[PDB]
Amino acid sequence: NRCLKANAKSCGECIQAGPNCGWCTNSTFLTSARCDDLEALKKKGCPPDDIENPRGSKDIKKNKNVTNLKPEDITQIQPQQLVLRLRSGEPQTFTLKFKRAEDYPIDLYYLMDLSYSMKDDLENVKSLGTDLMNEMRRITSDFRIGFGSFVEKTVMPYISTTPAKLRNPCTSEQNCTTPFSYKNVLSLTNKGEVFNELVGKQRISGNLDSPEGGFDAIMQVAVCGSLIGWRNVTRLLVFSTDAGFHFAGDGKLGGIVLPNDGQCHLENNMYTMSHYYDYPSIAHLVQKLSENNIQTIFAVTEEFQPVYKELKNLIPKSAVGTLSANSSNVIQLIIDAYNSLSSEVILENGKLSEGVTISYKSYCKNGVNGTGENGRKCSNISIGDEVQFEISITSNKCPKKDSDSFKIRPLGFTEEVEVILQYICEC
Amino acid sequence: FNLDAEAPAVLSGPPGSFFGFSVEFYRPGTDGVSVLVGAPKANTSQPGVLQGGAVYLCPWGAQCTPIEFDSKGSRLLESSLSSSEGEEPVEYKSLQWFGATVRAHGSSILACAPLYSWRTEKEPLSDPVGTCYLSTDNFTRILEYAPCRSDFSWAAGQGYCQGGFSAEFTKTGRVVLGGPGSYFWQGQILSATQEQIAESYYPEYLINLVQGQLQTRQASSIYDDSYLGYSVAVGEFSGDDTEDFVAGVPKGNLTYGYVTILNGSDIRSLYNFSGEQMASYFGYAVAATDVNGDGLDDLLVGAPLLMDRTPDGRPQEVGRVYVYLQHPAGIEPTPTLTLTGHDEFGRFGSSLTPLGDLDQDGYNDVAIGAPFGGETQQGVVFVFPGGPGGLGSKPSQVLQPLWAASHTPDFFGSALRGGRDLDGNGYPDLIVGSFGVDKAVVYRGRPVV
Ligand SMILES: *[C@@H]1O[C@H](CO)[C@@H](O[C@@H]2O[C@H](CO)[C@@H](O[C@@H]3O[C@H](CO[C@H]4O[C@H](CO)[C@@H](O)[C@H](O[C@H]5O[C@H](CO)[C@@H](O)[C@H](O)[C@@H]5O)[C@@H]4O)[C@@H](O)[C@H](O[C@H]4O[C@H](CO)[C@@H](O)[C@H](O)[C@@H]4O)[C@@H]3O)[C@H](O)[C@H]2NC(C)=O)[C@H](O)[C@H]1NC(C)=O
Ligand SMILES: *[C@@H]1O[C@H](CO)[C@@H](O[C@@H]2O[C@H](CO)[C@@H](O)[C@H](O)[C@H]2NC(C)=O)[C@H](O)[C@H]1NC(C)=O
Ligand SMILES: *[C@@H]1O[C@H](CO)[C@@H](O[C@@H]2O[C@H](CO)[C@@H](O)[C@H](O)[C@H]2NC(C)=O)[C@H](O)[C@H]1NC(C)=O
Ligand SMILES: *[C@@H]1O[C@H](CO)[C@@H](O[C@@H]2O[C@H](CO)[C@@H](O)[C@H](O)[C@H]2NC(C)=O)[C@H](O)[C@H]1NC(C)=O
Ligand SMILES: *[C@@H]1O[C@H](CO)[C@@H](O[C@@H]2O[C@H](CO)[C@@H](O)[C@H](O)[C@H]2NC(C)=O)[C@H](O)[C@H]1NC(C)=O
Ligand SMILES: *[C@@H]1O[C@H](CO)[C@@H](O)[C@H](O)[C@H]1NC(C)=O
Ligand SMILES: *[C@@H]1O[C@H](CO)[C@@H](O)[C@H](O)[C@H]1NC(C)=O
Ligand SMILES: *[C@@H]1O[C@H](CO)[C@@H](O)[C@H](O)[C@H]1NC(C)=O
Ligand SMILES: *[C@@H]1O[C@H](CO)[C@@H](O)[C@H](O)[C@H]1NC(C)=O
Ligand SMILES: [Ca+2]
Ligand SMILES: [Ca+2]
Ligand SMILES: [Ca+2]
Ligand SMILES: [Ca+2]
Ligand SMILES: [Ca+2]
Ligand SMILES: [Ca+2]
Ligand SMILES: [Mg+2]
């Protein structure tokens, strides 16, 4: 074994070398041979009152039961805080319960491509505010909607820069407004009528290359916080477009080399830095959408389904729907997407110290049990359903003498479990 | 491991000029051995031209002076000289990023302005066709070469080509240009010999008339927005003595990206290599060099936005480089080796260069830039050793700026050029640009054993 082959010179070393090791201190043991298996020691005449064997532990510290109310007074995950003392190489496992709340508020921000092919769509979305509100009455008791528009970076080569085309990027007869990156038209409000009023006043625009600059807008919607109005509720971002998307690296064609900084840069409700920061990368959006608990609904036309479906596989808590040619079906699209998103829970953890590892096992409905990366998720979660996760943590070092802490939480939610780690390195 | 990192030579250019955006070696012989540095936002003495961009000549010996490729301001539309009431320009040299690319071969220097645009002499456009200037015979003749300044205007044609966005010389001095915007950003590769360029150079006529020019063809609209020519390199991959064209196509194939190798004789497609993740920008950077001493050039491709996952489950942008070893019957589509960055948002694989054989052990080595790597995100350059089994998976050296971080990113490692011996000691040297702070750094190989 590796208890003896460690040559433990002290009880200390003996601990860090093997979870199956124990240490004798009697000096009635006929050197490093005092470090042997818990059985190999008893078989060699070591009183259990002498075999020093520190073991890891679990102590739950906060444990409000799942609910059955303001959102913050609603509990969907338990426990909320625990302490794990970790013997090197010995996992400590605990159970997370997740219960889908019966009724939870929804903030939905409708972020719309307003390039010229979306002109007919814009005509339909004119009543979307009130129609969606009416539908949502049967989904939640507390719904708010907002609206933003995007087109493109306002620089060569993505837009034409002749004086005429800057005034009107479209044909002479088409009365398009000047190209713009992103306009935060309407912050989240419970007044659907106001959504109708404002969206009805928006002017369609245009630009030159087919992919659009919506990733610039998504980033702003994710990180602009109170300017958008997000509450700590279900946050839905509907991204509506009939084209593909620019991303990081595309900016170099326009001489834009600074990476997106992922900070808010709205002035007078407009994004002002599209000429200065590159489009975000997918990974950057992943970071910022996740961090801000945004669940994305890609409402995109048939021809770009292939692209957005791959995008959806890279962005956690996202869904894809097929938008009709004039957004006529967008309400049912949004409903279907919300239902899909709400019925799946995905756990993430914060960064662990070196030598520390985490494994998940999920226990879902109809005895569907996930392991590996699938242990982080459950699917087909209906309203009121409970699911559970067995979460195992192991230290294989002596990571610090200082305690660590990290969070486990379901993507899209503020609620989280604080896991405090303590490392047994000494006797 | 033998580059002198303790005391490299730091070149500095004008602030905000982006001095260091491109870097190159120049040797019309040897006594005039020099470093070339592109500064695409530099102001020039060209009348009426704001930030035309410049290329600096830096003689290596005992510092940097701009080369006068073009002393003139933006030309005027001849029909407006008096027919109309008010001259107007036919082209737009302001903000054109001249020196975004600088390449040299013998006593020739190619420098490109990928944001150069022009009006055409017909309907008024704002067509960023791009242009290049070619110095030949050590500055005794200067040619403009703008193969995308053609009869076929606007985005549908070559109007948005941005020719010279990437560029390279072959070993015989043939010019190879990437223009990612041709045909609604399908992108294009165009190539001509210097003789062919000089043979039809006639500045009185703005449209390109080079005869014998090689270029890729317009494809159907399903290929739009691919950016072929985002990057370019050259190497021998076809079994003859005419170097072939390696081009990045980073948005091709659903934004998975691919890299293509074109027959250097007739620009016909020979090989494709596919990226592994959507929007990872596979093809952002490309290089070709023999990394295992068998005399067959090998392919390296950068994908600096490659997102992978930590063992504890966290996604992170880190970037990845892919290496494909050539063999006598061809070259396989799946990489022999991958190298992955460790710094979140570091953009590992943003730049690649052959180093030649840095330690003279019989195997050529490679540098890979990660312009936002390092503990203060200033950028990092990794040297990877060649060997009999290919490129090593661990760097033999790691270069970082010796100056502190500042208010704005350094971009150290965003431009690289190795493979030449600057000081004649028989060990190849390395130029690293750090354009965010308007510096370039020269590293010299120290002798070994
Ligand atoms: C690496 O990966 C790249 C990218 O996938 C591959 O490049 C692509 O290869 C395919 C297959 O060869 C190309 O599609 C074909 O294009 C040829 C080119 O035809 C040319 O010559 C014709 C004869 O003179 C001419 O008619 C064509 O002109 C027409 O089309 C252009 C563009 O639409 C238009 O401008 C013209 O007005 C004409 O309308 C053109 O100049 C073509 O002949 C092929 O036709 C076959 O397939 C089509 C569809 O399946 C079918 O309709 C035909 O009947 C015929 O069966 C086909 O269109 C594609 O263009 C390449 N894309 C790019 C960007 O280069 C490459 O092959 C890969 N390399 C390797 C080594 O794997
Ligand atoms: C959403 O919830 C977060 C977390 O509960 C709130 O931010 C916290 O605010 C309290 C007091 O304001 C601080 O003690 C915490 O340190 C904060 N944590 C974080 C991560 O910010 C946030 O204010 C809530 N947002 C809204 C819009 O209500
Ligand atoms: C998934 O795991 C669950 C564990 O909870 C399994 O269901 C339990 O099975 C045991 C015996 O097999 C019973 O004693 C429990 O009553 C079951 N629990 C419930 C809630 O029914 C389930 O069989 C596993 N399924 C698969 C496919 O492995
Ligand atoms: C190139 O020269 C122009 C003009 O002198 C510089 O632009 C000026 O910069 C100052 C300070 O930023 C401003 O107050 C002026 O309004 C600018 N003038 C114009 C016409 O833009 C520019 O900064 C110089 N660029 C470099 C790289 O040196
Ligand atoms: C690269 O292109 C050259 C030129 O098209 C090819 O060489 C030609 O090969 C054909 C055979 O199909 C001969 O009939 C011609 O005489 C050759 N021309 C020249 C100029 O050499 C060459 O085969 C191509 N290489 C590959 C690997 O396809
Ligand atoms: C969408 O366009 C079609 C055109 O055929 C039209 O019939 C339909 O009414 C439009 N959608 C809505 C919701 O009006
Ligand atoms: C979800 O679970 C229910 C059982 O409550 C089952 O009837 C249904 O088929 C499941 N749906 C899917 C998509 O697995
Ligand atoms: C090349 O030109 C430079 C001046 O720019 C000069 O100093 C150098 O001697 C010349 N070299 C040759 C070989 O003519
Ligand atoms: C295109 O992408 C698909 C899926 O990523 C891949 O299987 C295929 O090999 C790629 N083809 C080319 C020519 O890049
Ligand atoms: Ca439409
Ligand atoms: Ca666009
Ligand atoms: Ca060849
Ligand atoms: Ca080789
Ligand atoms: Ca070597
Ligand atoms: Ca040297
Ligand atoms: Mg559009």
All structural domains of chain A, each given as residue ranges with its CATH number in brackets, are 1-52 (3.30.1680.10), 53-102+343-427 (2.60.40.1510), 103-342 (3.40.50.410)
Residues B370-380 as b or e (16 or more Cβ within 10 Å = b): bbbbbeebbbb
Q: Do the Cβ atoms of A259 and B345 come within 8 Å?
A: yes
Q: Which helix (H) or strand (E) holds B327?
A: strand B326-327
Q: In chain A, whose CA is at the least distance from the CA of B285? A: A249
The answer to whether B316 and B310 have CB atoms below 8 angstroms apart is yes
What domain count does chain B have? 1
Inform me whether the C-beta atom of residue B255 falls under 8 Å from chain A C-beta atoms.
yes
d(CA B390, CA A55): 47
Tokens of A144: 């708010």
Closest Cα in chain A to B229: A253
> A221: closest CA among A328, A312, A296?
A296
- Is B429 annotated in some ligand binding site? yes
- B57, B138, B139, B142: residue to mutate for ligand 8 pocket, most atoms within 8 A of CB: B138
- For residue B37 the two structure tokens come to 């540095």
Q: Sheet containing B22-26: which strands, arranged edge to edge?
A: B22-26, B34-39, B54-59, B65-66
> Degrees (nearest 5) of the Cα angle B304, B305, B307?
120
Between chains, do A307 and B254 touch, taking CB under 8 Å as contact? yes
CATH of the domain at B433: 2.130.10.130
SS3 letters for A13-42?
HHHHCCCCEEECCCCCCCCHHHEEEHHHHH
Query: What value, to the nearest 5°, has the Cα angle with vertex B373 and ends B372 and B376?
Result: 85
Helices A214-223 and A282-291 pack at an angle, to 10 degrees, of 20
Enumerate the β-bridge partners of residue B37. B23, B56
Q: Which residue, among B254, B207, B201, B264, has the nearest Cα to B232 in the 3D structure?
A: B264
**CB contact at 8 A, A132 and A331:** yes
Name the one residue in this structure whose structure tokens are 């012989």. Answer: B29
| Structure determined via | X-ray
Is the CB of B32 inside a 6 Å radius of any atom of ligand 8?
Answer: yes
- Which residues of A touch chain B, with CB atoms under 8 Å apart? 156-157, 160-162, 164-165, 208-211, 244, 247-250, 253-255, 257-259, 281-284, 286-287, 306-307, 310-311, 314, 348-352, 356-358, 373, 376
Full DSSP string of A57-111: EEEEEE-PPPP---GGG---EE--EEEEEEETT--EEEEEEEE--SS--EEEEEE
Q: For A367, which DSSP code? A: G
Rounded to a whole number of angstroms, the distance from the CA of A377 to the nearest CA of chain B is 13
Type of residue at B147: P
For residue A99, list its beta bridge partners. Answer: A386
H and E: helices and strands count for chain B: 2, 34
Q: Which domain holds residue B335?
A: 1-449
Q: How many CB atoms lie within 10 A of CB A303?
A: 11
